[PDB]
Structure formats: structure tokens, C-alpha cells
Amino acid sequence: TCGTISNKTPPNMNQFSSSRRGVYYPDDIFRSDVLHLTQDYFLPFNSNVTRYLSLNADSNRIVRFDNPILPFGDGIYFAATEKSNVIRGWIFGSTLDNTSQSAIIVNNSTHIIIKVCNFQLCDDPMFTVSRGQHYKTWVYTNARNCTYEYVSKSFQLDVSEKNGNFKHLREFVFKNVDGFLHVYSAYEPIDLARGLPSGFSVLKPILKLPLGINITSFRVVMTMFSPTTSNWLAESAAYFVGYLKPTT
Amino acid sequence: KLPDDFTGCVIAWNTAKQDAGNYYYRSHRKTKLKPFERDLSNSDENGVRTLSTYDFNPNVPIEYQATRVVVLSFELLNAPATVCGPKLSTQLVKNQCVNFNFNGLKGTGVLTDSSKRFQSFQQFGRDASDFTDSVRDPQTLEILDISPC
Numbered sequence: 001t002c003g004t005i006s007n008k009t010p011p012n013m014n015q016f017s018s019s020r021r022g023v024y025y026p027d028d029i030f031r032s033d034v035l036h037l038t039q040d041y042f043l044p045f046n047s048n049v050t051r052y053l054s055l056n057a058d059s060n061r062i063v064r065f066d067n068p069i070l071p072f073g074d075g076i077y078f079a080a081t082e083k084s085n086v087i088r089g090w091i092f093g094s095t096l097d098n099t100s101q102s103a104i105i106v107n108n109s110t111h112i113i114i115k116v117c118n119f120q121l122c123d124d125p126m127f128t129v130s131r132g133q134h135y136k137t138w139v140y141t142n143a144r145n146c147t148y149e150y151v152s153k154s155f156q157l158d159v160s161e162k163n164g165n166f167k168h169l170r171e172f173v174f175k176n177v178d179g180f181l182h183v184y185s186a187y188e189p190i191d192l193a194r195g196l197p198s199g200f201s202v203l204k205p206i207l208k209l210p211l212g213i214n215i216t217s218f219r220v221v222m223t224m225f226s227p228t229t230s231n232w233l234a235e236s237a238a239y240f241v242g243y244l245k246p247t248t
Numbered sequence: 249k250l251p252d253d254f255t256g257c258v259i260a261w262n263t264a265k266q267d268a269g270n271y272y273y274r275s276h277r278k279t280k281l282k283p284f285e286r287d288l289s290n291s292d293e294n295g296v297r298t299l300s301t302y303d304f305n306p307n308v309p310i311e312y313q314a315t316r317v318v319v320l321s322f323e324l325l326n327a328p329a330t331v332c333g334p335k336l337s338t339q340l341v342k343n344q345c346v347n348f349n350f351n352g353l354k355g356t357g358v359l360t361d362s363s364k365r366f367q368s369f370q371q372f373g374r375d376a377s378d379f380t381d382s383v384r385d386p387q388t389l390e391i392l393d394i395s396p397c
């Protein structure tokens with residue numbers, strides 16, 4: 001089964017700067033004490049980056065739960081500014097429907113799951129949180145022809161609807177080259193209400209996944225919350241998308 | 249599709265006796281595959297299949313007979329060895345000019361202990377000339393300096 005959202009407001013797509021944000025290791029070669037000049041898909045400095053929100057404003061009954069199908073370019077830069085682990089992961093593919101294989105990468109509350117299958121996706125792929133704890137996964141209805149799976153070691157997230165401004169900045173770069181999805185990441189403690197903070201970031205290689213799939217599009221998987229297992233509420237989080245461009 | 253930067257081996261052999269049956273290949277696509285891309289789509293938008301069929305029988309002409317193919321793709325990074333050839337390991341011989349072979353990294357030079365801090369994954373070190381000046385001994389995990397003979 002799937003969750004549903006009634007009367008989203010559409011994404012406002014405000015734009016912010018990737019100020020030196022989002023550098024990553026371009027190749028697997030170990031280098032030490034050297035200056036390396038290289039042509040690769042990088043996010044240019046001070047590039048425009050588009051903001052997407054999950055937000056709830058009951059005083060206007062305004063909901064935002066911005067999970068559009070975004071293009072995947074020559075790879076993407078992705079950053080979540082976060083306080084309640086609303087951003088749980090991503091769906092990668094082409095059609096993002098059962099006619100093609102898609103890769104789902106999600107922090108399911110106790111395990112990172114990676115699967116490649118002919119998923120039937122929900123219209124709003126999401127997790128749910130009841131009473132501050134994991135409820136149910138509304139990401140996909142059918143798995144069909146799975147051909148890759150990975151599951152990370154056990155953990156627990158904090159899943160409560162923590163109050164205040166954002167405290168976690170999680171950064172990612174995704175590249176799909178020679179049938180590997182490369183994932184790079186960094187984490188930074190933050191204490192800000194809006195936008196990306198300015199600053200230099202280098203993202204470490206986290207994953208090479210031998211997913212032979214065509215990745216053309218992606219979208220984010222997010223939580224909704226409730227105290228009473230119904231009337232699911234959006235909760236304040238923002239994510240930022242930038243596109244890698246061939247640059248030296 | 250193989251990449252242009254491919255490193256690896258392509259291996260094939262005839263199996264027309266074993267692999268009788270029906271097997272499929274994509275005869276047409278709107279765009280070529282990327283290297284190591286896969287496309288499992290059977291039906292088109294209307295429902296007719298996009299895949300052609302090999303009819304494999306031992307009775308078909310040789311050119312049409314089934315071959316199995318294995319493609320091995322390799323990497324030789326500055327990272328721990330994961331697959332190795334059957335070579336037996338010798339003792340170390342330090343402070344002498346010797347040939348050496350560490351994880352298939354051949355060379356010649358003088359081996360000594362070293363003060364080098366390596367990274368947890370790192371197997372060898374190089375100076376600004378790419379002269380390999382240190383190597384992790386895969387047996388003891390100790391770091392050896394390599395000097396010119």
C-alpha cells in the first residue's frame with residue numbers, strides 16, 4: 001500500500017549558491033602531496049542550486065512535500081539540510097515505473113537498503129513515523145525482477161520530529177559511469193534556518209554499486225509523521241540539487 | 249557494451265551441445281547502450297516483444313552455434329589485493345639489492361624497515377617522481393622502504 005498527500009503546494013524552486021560546496025575525489029587513484037589538474041564532471045563553484053522543501057503550515061493548511069522527478073544529468077550534487085531525518089533516500093532510474101529497472105537507495109530506519117528491481121513506485125514514495133518511531137514503508141508496491149540487493153549493518157536513527165532550526169547538512173554526489181553508481185558523501189554540523197551555508201566541501205567515496213541500469217531521472221524519498229497513525233504531517237526539511245558539468 | 253578504458257579479459261567457448269533452447273537478444277533500440285549498461289525491457293509500449301530469439305541447436309551452422317562468454321573486468325588500485333595468482337611467498341631479504349614482487353608489483357631495489365605511516369588500505373607509496381619508495385608487506389603488514397640499488 002501507499003501513503004497519499006492531498007493538496008500539495010507545487011515546488012517553488014528557489015535558488016542558492018554552491019559556493020565551493022561539493023568537491024569530490026574524481027578517480028580511485030591514491031595521491032599524496034600533489035596538485036592534480038583534471039577535467040571531469042564537477043559542480044562549478046557558485047553554481048545555482050535549486051531548493052526543494054518538505055514543510056507543514058497548518059495555519060494555512062499549506063503542505064509542501066517536494067518530491068518531483070528530477071533529471072539526472074552527468075550526475076548530480078545533492079545536499080539535505082535536516083533536523084528530523086526527513087530525507088531517507090532516493091530512487092534512480094529512467095521511467096521510474098515497472099517498465100524499467102530502478103535503483104532504490106533508502107535509509108530504512110534500521111538498515112540502508114539498496115535494490116534494483118522493476119519497482120512499481122508509489123505516487124509519493126515515502127516512509128512513515130508514528131509517535132516518534134518507525135511505522136511503515138510506503139516506497140513501492142511491487143518489486144518484480146530484482147537483480148541487485150545490498151543491506152547495510154544494523155543501526156537506529158533518531159526519528160522524532162525534533163524542533164528548531166536545521167542541525168545536519170548531509171552532502172552527496174552521484175555519478176553513473178561504466179555501470180557503477182558512484183556515491184560520494186560528506187557530513188557537516190550546521191545551525192541555520194535557511195539555504196545552504198557557504199563553505200568548501202570534499203565528499204569521500206561511499207559506494208560503487210555495479211548497477212547496470214540506465215539512470216536518467218531521480219527523486220527523493222521522505223518521511224511523513226503522525227501521533228495517531230493517520231492524517232500524516234509533513235515536517236520541515238530542505239534539500240538542494242545541483243548538476244555536475246564537464247569542467248577542469 | 250565494453251568501455252574504451254576496459255581492462256580485463258574476454259573468454260568464450262562453444263557450448264552448442266549444452267545450451268540448446270531459446271535465448272534472446274535485442275535487435276533494435278532507439279539509442280546504443282552505455283558501457284556495462286543493461287536493458288531488461290521485454291514488451292514495447294503496445295505489448296509486442298522487442299527481443300529477437302536465438303534458435304540454438306547443435307544442428308545449426310557453426311557461426312550460429314551457441315558460445316558462452318565470460319568477461320572478467322580487473323582493477324589494480326593502491327588497495328588490498330582481492331584475487332591473486334598462485335605464487336608462493338619467500339622470506340624477506342632486507343639491506344640487500346634484490347628483485348622483489350609484492351602483490352604482483354615487481355621491481356628491484358633495497359628493502360628496509362620504514363617509519364612510514366600508511367593509510368589502512370594503502371599498499372605502496374610513491375614520491376613526486378612516482379618512484380615507489382615504500383610497500384606494505386602483505387604477510388606482516390609492516391611497511392618497507394625501497395631504495396635504489
Ligand SMILES: *[C@@H]1O[C@H](CO)[C@@H](O[C@@H]2O[C@H](CO)[C@@H](O)[C@H](O)[C@H]2NC(C)=O)[C@H](O)[C@H]1NC(C)=O
Nearest residue numbers: 093094095100214215216278279280281282285
Ligand atoms: C535511458 O533512458 C532514457 C529515458 O527512459 C532514454 O531516453 C529516451 O530516448 C529516446 C531516444 O533517444 C527518446 O525518443 C525518448 O523520448 C527518451 N525519453 C526520455 C524520457 O528522455 C534513453 O534513450 C535511455 N538510454 C540511454 C543510453 O540513455
Ligand SMILES: *[C@@H]1O[C@H](CO)[C@@H](O)[C@H](O)[C@H]1NC(C)=O
Nearest residue numbers: 013014015016046047048049
Ligand atoms: C541563476 O544564475 C544566474 C546566473 O548564473 C543568476 O543571475 C540568477 O540569479 C540565478 N538564480 C536566481 C534565482 O537568482
Ligand SMILES: *[C@@H]1O[C@H](CO)[C@@H](O)[C@H](O)[C@H]1NC(C)=O
Nearest residue numbers: 108109110111112113134151
Ligand atoms: C528495514 O527496517 C525494518 C525496521 O525498521 C527492519 O525490520 C527491516 O529488516 C529493514 N530492512 C531490511 C532489508 O533489513
Ligand SMILES: *[C@@H]1O[C@H](CO)[C@@H](O)[C@H](O)[C@H]1NC(C)=O
Nearest residue numbers: 118144145146287288289290
Ligand atoms: C521477470 O519476472 C516475471 C515474473 O514475475 C517473469 O515472467 C519474467 O520472465 C522475468 N523477466 C526476466 C528478464 O527475468
Ligand SMILES: *[C@@H]1O[C@H](CO)[C@@H](O)[C@H](O)[C@H]1NC(C)=O
Nearest residue numbers: 337384385386387388389390
Ligand atoms: C599470513 O597472513 C597473516 C596476516 O597477513 C600473517 O599473520 C601470517 O603470518 C601470514 N603467514 C602465515 C604462515 O600465517
